[model samples]
Target: NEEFDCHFLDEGFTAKDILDQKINEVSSSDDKDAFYVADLGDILKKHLRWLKALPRVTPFYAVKCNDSKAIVKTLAATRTGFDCASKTEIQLVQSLGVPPERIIYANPCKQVSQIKYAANNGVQMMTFDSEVELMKVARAHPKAKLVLRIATDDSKAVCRLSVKFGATLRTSRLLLERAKELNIDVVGVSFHVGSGCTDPETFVQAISDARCVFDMGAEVGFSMYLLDIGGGFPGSEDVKLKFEEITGVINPALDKYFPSDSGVRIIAEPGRYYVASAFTLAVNIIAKKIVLEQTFMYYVNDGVYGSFNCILYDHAHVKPLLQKRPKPDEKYYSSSIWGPTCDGLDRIVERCDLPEMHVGDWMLFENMGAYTVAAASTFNGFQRPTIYYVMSGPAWQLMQQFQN
Candidate 1:
């Protein structure tokens, strides 16, 4: 949980204070390297927003999004549950002392051994969308309570998962029927509108789809009690749809379909929304070159293989804010940012405008918490940045109150 590196802000200082402080600590030395300054308070505020907007739905934080030990520990303390994709993730959360009920094995098509692990570990709530998975579950873990994952109109998403994971609404009918045939307990329905969704209308349609699936379960003699509205909500402020905008549609849709008294327990799997903006990465300039008139290329300590892996994998867009501000009349040059790797594909930013800078300078990147470090690799021997966690006194006190 980043115990040694974590700092408790003494009621007055801020997360930025630590970032600026860290940069200054290494300012006079050659140890100026890439690092991340993350705030725990921002996560708590995001959680509060989620509760106020969609009060009826409980959040089961998706562990696959960013399995940072510090992030997971903060979530567990806040009463937020987990949506574990595999055995290892479930083990991590369970080993951290979270209860079995707080963990959902949300993967539709899972390995048989993982199913056995869930069963043995008492993780009864899981999701399924395929007949192959259904039969395997019937044989391997008959005590499982399955949530049928249905496809959504995820055409507007940056990264669509409907193509790979969820079942079509019509096919879900057959799946529920098949579940009844095998005496498998189909208890709920789940859906993800994909990551980086732009449309609020998509959520309304998915919620209505879930209602139909719930009725289909009832017709098949299964009492559907859980409705998992999976992750797609915005994390950072740059998105077209705000977190509250998505929830604005979701709250009414839930009221019209599932309703407050519908005996169905509603939950959501929010990964990026909680941790995105809380993290800020600082990369140091390692090399610089002047190619031609008004054009320059600068190399940084981190590259695509490290913290900036989100550029290729998650389709992230980043801009570097200089640590040392330029003069008021500083001349801007055509500049591009590169990573500290031999591979030509390790470009961080294609082009941008920046004042002239030298080696040992710092570049700041914001909103780097989600899908950044979890998928990073140590390719070309470039290592991941170290993260320093900071939380304000009020945030920490509120966090302590959550457990009580």
Candidate 2:
């Protein structure tokens, strides 16, 4: 018998048990909106993979990916660090009793108020890309340790961040010189190859660039030991892009450029890679209509403004799965899933095949842990989905231990 349980519930339950009960209750009740099931076991598995692949690098979970307190608390329990972009996110991590040193203010362009917040809260590590940002840090928090954000070839990524942040190699020297002149402590170098990057060569090239920048910091008389390889890891396990392929390239490159004995402290700011596959979203079918009598349309409780926001922001393709599978000979037809909002652009699934689903029937979406609910909003009076956490038997036991 398992001896662990969730504090939110009784002493005899696991998260999976709780989730099953919640699903059963909701299925039998009048609740129509969607809900989420977060699996802590999945996160633990990913963390193990991170250790096996890049054993030397510490992972800093990106808060913007999924800032659910439960998720953050779980990551914190694993001794994982955090990548915070804003004061609110920093505070969110802090509220979980995580120390400030375990956080990296990874955003290059930061607000002055946030800089002061970080300073006051003892968050000494942060990133900067421009001379103006360097000056702001120097003025607001001179005692801060700065990491230079450098540009990488992000053309092969789903979301290229180099266009907005990161200083180019052509300008890096000048930036380092400015930091030195301003007496700012340039402690390390950081770069993101962009989110959802496919090209492994980008990592090799970014590592090479980081090495060059490290030499630049050395020449400028600043100690450069930390290297922040920002996020580009894949979230979904079903994707053609495998995290193993990335680690295969990253490991050899790290061995060459930043050996374990090289005194360089390596870390990563992975957002979606940690929690994306750990979540499943269950939405209720609110209404449906026949489109030209040949196709069916599904109006769901959640839409573009809700958990499906990833469809618009990250160019995500969400496939809806019926709670019950059709019989072998049961006929199916083309269908679409729309949101509860009045806007025509609130479409969730433009085209999919379904086997005669009715209103109140539930559809579940997997691999929704990243960037889905994090960007959700209560648009048009339609609220976001509630979350339910699922854990393995041992994790439930650990949760009980953490609570005590």
| Local distance difference test values of all predictions, in order | 0.89, 0.85
> What are the TM-scores, per candidate, against the unseen true structure?
0.97, 0.92
Error of 2 at 364 (Å): 0.7
Q: Please state the error at residue 353 of candidate 1 in Å.
A: 0.7
Please write out the lDDT profile of model 1 over residues 165-263, one tens digit for every residue. 888878998999999999899999999887757778888899999999999988989999999999977788987778877888788889999987879
lDDT of 2 by residue, 1-404 (tens): 11122235444764445555666776766666687777777787788788788888999999999988878888888888999999999999999999999999998999999999999999999999999998899889998999999988766555565388888887999999999899899989999986657678789999999999999988889999999988869977788878989989998999899887879999999999999888888888889898774789988888889998899798888888776656878778899899999898999988888988888887888888889888998888877776766666665565555445
Clash pairs, model 1 backbone = none
Candidate 1: what lDDT? 0.89
The TM-score of predicted model 1 comes to 0.97
